Design a protein around this ligand. Structure first.
Ligand SMILES: NC(=O)c1ccc[n+]([C@@H]2O[C@H](COP(=O)([O-])OP(=O)(O)OC[C@H]3O[C@@H](n4cnc5c(N)ncnc54)[C@H](O)[C@@H]3O)[C@@H](O)[C@H]2O)c1
Ligand SMILES: NC(=O)c1ccc[n+]([C@@H]2O[C@H](COP(=O)([O-])OP(=O)(O)OC[C@H]3O[C@@H](n4cnc5c(N)ncnc54)[C@H](O)[C@@H]3O)[C@@H](O)[C@H]2O)c1
Ligand SMILES: Oc1cc(Cl)ccc1Oc1ccc(Cl)cc1Cl
Ligand SMILES: Oc1cc(Cl)ccc1Oc1ccc(Cl)cc1Cl
Lengths: 257, 258, 228, 241
């Protein structure tokens, strides 16, 4: 086996801008020679994403809208991906949401709607996407999601997000039990803190300063490092790996002390 | 210190019948000298809980309805508890639910509706009950909930229930981090399978039991008494150094599996 | 059903002084009515424990020397336990810059004293624990490696001895007394931990209240295990 | 970056025959353009390692003796690696051992010797070799060791205990060495049955190629954000009951 992804069609859901971790993954998958399929939420993000495919070397790229809440316009999105490429070999799911006033101080500032909300977007969406994409993954494939250490441990201010990530963390395991027999693998990457759109939602430079000082590899993670890990996960090089969670975070996971 | 729960009021949510784990927690806590405040899920259970509580040695037990899917009923229920006993010293969270056709076959038999229902009843309800109960919890406190190995590993057919349990597992940690400053500890018991109402709907059960009688280290299945008695510890001050923890009360099965 | 340790004989290994966690454990178990059997390593401690046994309500404690490093001595210590009481219901095992400051022999030695020793003492206690029993062990660098070895063995021990109604578990106690300050600021419960707290947890693990629990690790640390 | 191991010198230890996981691993690092330094314990393997080492093209490989007990000849070994190649970029540690009568029946079948022996060979040897290799590891690096599910909970006995020691020595080695830009990670392999084949997510068993491919990743710059990690190469067996 080798590492390349040529002839592999991968949807990368969740790019917002040049800082999106999805975007760093997009880049690494493209370098490996995959054909990317971006999906975005709304229509305000329409130009920014087209503007990013454009800047990618080869052509390839398709660009569909997909709000992950809403089964209706999820099917639309994948009926369309099938029209335009047919067999899908992979999905990078990099989509989470929480109310930002629930991510301050106490976990307890959350509430029924906010809680269900975080779980719907951050956790359920993966299952939803997988249900859609499944009929089209007929040559087997690989599914990757992004998680944070806060799913495992208590990270100041991650609060309800941490709970939903724990929910996602677990769904990864189950999805993997269901889909291994169709030779589809499901794993997560657990990225270290990196500056993104969604990253503004408390005391951030605090965390980034601590890591370079406290994490084994005295530095911060990048979207590149993550994308490179993603690239391996989407490649057959990782064919033996399913239901795993890989900390791409300078080893910060081993220091809690 | 000591084992006695004399002078403590503990709210046990989730009694349904004599087989329920909450009922095992009930006895144990009552016999350690606690005053139990029960909650049933709507009027179907009203008569059955009154009859169960009536069997206890002392006759101080309180009995209130509380349907955890609804902020208003929750505070209503808790507003009453406050009037009656003034201070609450613990909660036994024993509430779960998910759609039964979701817990057969592939995890993928779930859907947006059921997933969130399962998370709402099974995971959110804890946070819910704590928000409401927090103002009454003024002399320390112990909150205990019930999870299962399915929230750690893939268990055949546990499926979306296990994912909700994982959400629960995490909330236990975040709640504990929020509430240790007010001297309230939050923990879970991870129970081995026991035959209860809710067990039905978890298909091929006496197969799973028999397995645990052979494979389990302690070579025997769990009892609600075992669980109840670990809850007793947890509610008591003997356990005052423990919070955010998860105790497997499961005859050691968790190790023979992993 | 009861928290009492009436008529339980518990060996408590690893008492050095009034500060020992082992000692907190001793107090709490004595308090629950257990009869304590203390072991010492080297005759400097013989007097330290002998002293401490005397602070205990009842003069029912037995004092024996046991160097966990040497099998023959361990076989002797327990033969003598059996002679005096015949049967034992529990063991409390409280014996233990860069990580790269370790070396073959010190590495083995940590593992010998800190890991293997639970297995060694359990092999000896085995044929005398016929009334069922509970075994509890206490858990930085090469020590952390040895502790990890100890943790894994708890599970292997548990899986083997369950058929004999013998439970094996561990307690992880947070720092007890400068690193302290931040814990009292960063700990869920906002305080270091105490040896009473550990002890009352060991009492639970030694009684029937905990009969369904085997192969587990209990964090007595004011919640610090859940924080980053 | 790139998946190429070109111009990296990686020590591979514990090759013994064409089945050896370390061989599966040798092959994969070789394919990616690494220069392999093989080590062997005593004459039995001397032959096999040489005979096997031959198999490969681009044959720039190195062959030397190294008993992982015996601090001196570990020193002897790496002193020589230094002479012949200057700088080391990785170790593939694939050594494990415990008496077989002890990996049968109860865990309590073990004794003081087999216990310590198992820890020596299976856990300490990683520290021994990282210590001896460290000085010559002056261009960043990657250390990768071989574990299994028995260190995580019950499956295997005293070897599971040893692997737990191993697993903890990894996190520690990682924390010490990140500063010098050296990564330390473990692969936990599936069995290399009838059980795994029908109850593992990917409905199949593990191949040494799957293990080698994962290694190539961790030795390469693709995995540069990862340290103190334990990857399960096991058709998802770790997630099951
Ligand atoms: N940034 C970090 O340090 C870090 C660490 C660990 C995990 N993560 C995870 O990485 C993932 C990507 O976020 P990011 O950090 O790159 O920030 P980002 O804001 O750049 O990306 C988040 C994406 O989620 C999308 N999204 C929100 N609601 C959506 C909806 N309903 N339908 C479709 N898309 C929706 C946004 O459009 C955006 O594309 C998230 O799941 C996040 O939790 C980030
Ligand atoms: N029996 C087992 O094998 C086992 C094992 C591990 C964990 N558990 C857990 O124990 C807990 C209790 O379940 P059980 O097994 O004792 O079964 P049970 O059916 O006896 O109790 C479940 C209870 O939740 C209550 N409930 C459901 N929806 C509610 C809502 N709308 N509002 C308020 N209450 C509601 C039900 O009335 C019922 O009393 C659950 O969390 C379950 O997951 C059970
Ligand atoms: O998961 C994350 C983890 C970190 Cl450290 C930083 C940013 C993250 O991503 C988010 C944070 C908050 C919200 Cl509301 C949405 C998203 Cl996508
Ligand atoms: O969580 C559980 C685990 C086990 Cl082994 C047995 C029963 C359980 O409890 C439930 C199972 C299914 C549903 Cl719908 C509701 C509940 Cl309360």
């Amino acid at each position: 086996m080798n590492f390349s992804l040529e002839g592999r069609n991968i949807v990368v859901m969740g790019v917002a801008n040049k800082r999106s971790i999805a975007w760093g993954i997009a880049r690494s998958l493209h370098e490996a020679g995959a054909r990317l399929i971006f999906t975005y939420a709304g229509e305000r993000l329409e130009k920014s994403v087209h503007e990013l495919a454009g800047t990618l070397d080869r052509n390839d790229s398709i660009i569909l809208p997909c709000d992950v809440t809403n089964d209706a316009e999820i099917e639309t999105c994948f009926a369309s991906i099938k029209e335009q490429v047919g067999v899908i070999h992979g999905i990078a799911h990099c989509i989470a949401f929480a109310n930002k006033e629930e991510l301050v101080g106490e976990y307890l500032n959350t509430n029924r709607d906010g809680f269900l909300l975080a779980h719907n977007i951050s956790s359920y969406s993966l299952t939803a996407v997988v249900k859609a994409a499944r009929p089209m993954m007929t040559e087997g494939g690989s599914i990757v999601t992004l998680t944070y250490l806060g799913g495992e441990l208590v990270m100041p201010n991650y609060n309800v997000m941490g709970v939903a990530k724990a929910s996602l963390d677990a769904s990864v395991k189950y999805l993997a039990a269901d889909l291994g027999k169709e030779n589809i693998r499901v794993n997560s990457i657990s990225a270290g803190p990196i500056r993104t759109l969604s990253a503004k939602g408390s005391d951030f430079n605090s965390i980034l300063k601590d890591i370079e000082e406290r994490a084994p590899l005295r530095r911060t993670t990048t979207p590149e490092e993550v994308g490179d890990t993603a690239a391996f996960l989407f490649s057959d090089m990782s064919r033996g790996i399913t239901g795993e969670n890989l900390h791409v975070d300078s080893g910060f996971h081993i220091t809690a002390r």
